[PDB]
């Protein structure tokens, strides 16, 4: 009933970098976190990381449920040397959406998910800040990129900032993770034409004993 995360950072339990593969649905009243824990495999950070850690520390653990997004006209299998899982891989709970072919236009898409449970749903997504505009063009097509998240009486947009920051280890881009808590019976909507890392599953707090 008390769990030692080791190399897995607590927020990694939500998105699933390879160091967190054995914790994607953990159950624990006390969570032990370690200096060697990392939330990420590709360089980046969680928005409101401190607040979200607070929520998860007293959550009693997490149970994952499918969000049911399906796709066509794009690749859903973006991967990176940074996340090693028998070669290049990605976050286990997320899908790195790419245009069907290099430099091809990414289609404007909209995906929605309704929380049909009685508890609030924790929903994460990533925004990819490519290391270069050529990379962004290569991955999603050229032109302006925009991601919009909406829920009941709420809308917020994110515009990728393609630039080259210090490498980690060799990659100058960043994937930052954003989240929201979806009330029972509310619907989250994502509108995006690229630079969007999509959730495959939502997380529900288990509650303590």
């Amino acid at each position: 009933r008390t769990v030692d995360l080791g190399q897995c950072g607590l927020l990694g339990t939500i998105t699933g970098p390879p160091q967190c593969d054995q914790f994607l649905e953990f159950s624990a009243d006390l969570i032990i976190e370690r200096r060697e824990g990392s939330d990420v495999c590709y360089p980046g950070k969680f928005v409101n990381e401190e607040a979200l850690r607070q929520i998860l520390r007293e959550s009693g653990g997490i149970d994952k449920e499918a969000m049911g997004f399906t796709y066509s006209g794009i690749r859903t299998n973006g991967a990176t040397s940074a996340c090693r899982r028998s070669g290049s891989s990605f976050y286990a709970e997320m899908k790195w959406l790419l245009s069907n072919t290099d430099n091809a236009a990414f289609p404007q898409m909209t995906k929605s998910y309704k929380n049909t449970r009685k508890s609030p749903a924790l929903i994460v997504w990533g925004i990819h800040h490519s290391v270069s505009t050529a990379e962004q063009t290569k991955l999603y097509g050229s032109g302006n990129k925009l991601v919009t998240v909406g829920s009941s009486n709420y809308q917020q947009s994110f515009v990728p900032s393609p630039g080259a920051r210090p490498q980690v280890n060799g990659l100058s881009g960043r994937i930052d993770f954003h989240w929201l808590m979806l009330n029972p019976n509310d619907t989250v909507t994502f509108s995006f034409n690229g630079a969007f890392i999509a959730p495959d599953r939502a997380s529900f707090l288990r509650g303590k004993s």
Partner: antibody, heavy 120, light 109 residues
Framework: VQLVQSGAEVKKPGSSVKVSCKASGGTFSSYAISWVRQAPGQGLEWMGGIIPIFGTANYAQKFQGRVTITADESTSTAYMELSSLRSEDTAVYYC??????????????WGQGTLVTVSS | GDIQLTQSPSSLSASVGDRVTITCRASQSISSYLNWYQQKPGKAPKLLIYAASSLQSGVPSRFSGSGSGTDFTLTISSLQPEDFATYYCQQSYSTPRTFGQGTKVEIKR
């Protein structure tokens, strides 16, 4: 959603105060409650927040475990208790509704405020 | 550590009909996680803009928020008499929540 706070308080240095914030309307469990204070003539200062449906709170470190925020879902009431009061704690204390559960904390509706005067 | 917000100007003189511009600069990049409030003497602040450019329901359309990353602006087009007040930015990106020092918009004469 209306937020109605308890009345003004006068306290001596070193004592403590507990302010109440009662939410009318619907579904206390559908949002978080934050506490923000304002000293006379000064700007705004965030103290912390609570998510009632989870019972979890988040605090500003500057307050050094002097603050305790709690909530009672049966009465749709949140509380802020501030201990070891000092003169600099003299301020109007507000509660506010944060629909984002700390994901993008914003203060969508506010209480009327509670003056707390700390003095000998 | 904490995110510091620097608002400017601190005090502004304006007339009805003016276009008023208030800037907020954050000490690190915070994407679109910035809110704007209005406050008048003796009253709690009131939310105008959340998420840098989303208009709160019921707020007049002359209030426009812009910016992403570190530089943010609140633009009040066509300043109205009920707009003379103090304005605050607040970042929603990190703990602790922090505010700009405020901008007072007063009546020119």
């Amino acid at each position: 959603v209306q937020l109605v706070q308890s009345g003004a308080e006068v306290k001596k240095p070193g004592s403590s105060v507990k302010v109440s914030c009662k939410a009318s309307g619907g579904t206390f469990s559908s949002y978080a409650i934050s506490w923000v204070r304002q000293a006379p003539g000064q700007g705004l200062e965030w103290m912390g927040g609570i998510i009632p449906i989870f019972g979890t709170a988040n605090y500003a470190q500057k307050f050094q475990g002097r603050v305790t925020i709690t909530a009672d879902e049966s009465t749709s009431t949140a509380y802020m208790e501030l201990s070891s009061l000092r003169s600099e704690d003299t301020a109007v204390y507000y509660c506010a509704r944060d629909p984002s559960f700390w994901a993008a904390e914003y203060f969508q509706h506010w209480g009327q405020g509670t003056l707390v005067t700390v003095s000998s | 550590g904490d995110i510091q917000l620097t608002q400017s100007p601190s005090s502004l003189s304006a007339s009805v009909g003016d276009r008023v511009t208030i800037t907020c600069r954050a000490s690190q990049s915070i994407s679109s996680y910035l809110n704007w409030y209005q406050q008048k003497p003796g009253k709690a602040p009131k939310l105008l803009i959340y998420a840098a450019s989303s208009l709160q329901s019921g707020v007049p359309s002359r209030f426009s928020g812009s910016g992403s990353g570190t530089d943010f602006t609140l633009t009040i087009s066509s300043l109205q008499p009920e707009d003379f007040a103090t304005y605050y930015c607040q970042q929603s990106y990190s703990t602790p929540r922090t505010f700009g020092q405020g901008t007072k918009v007063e009546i020119k004469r």
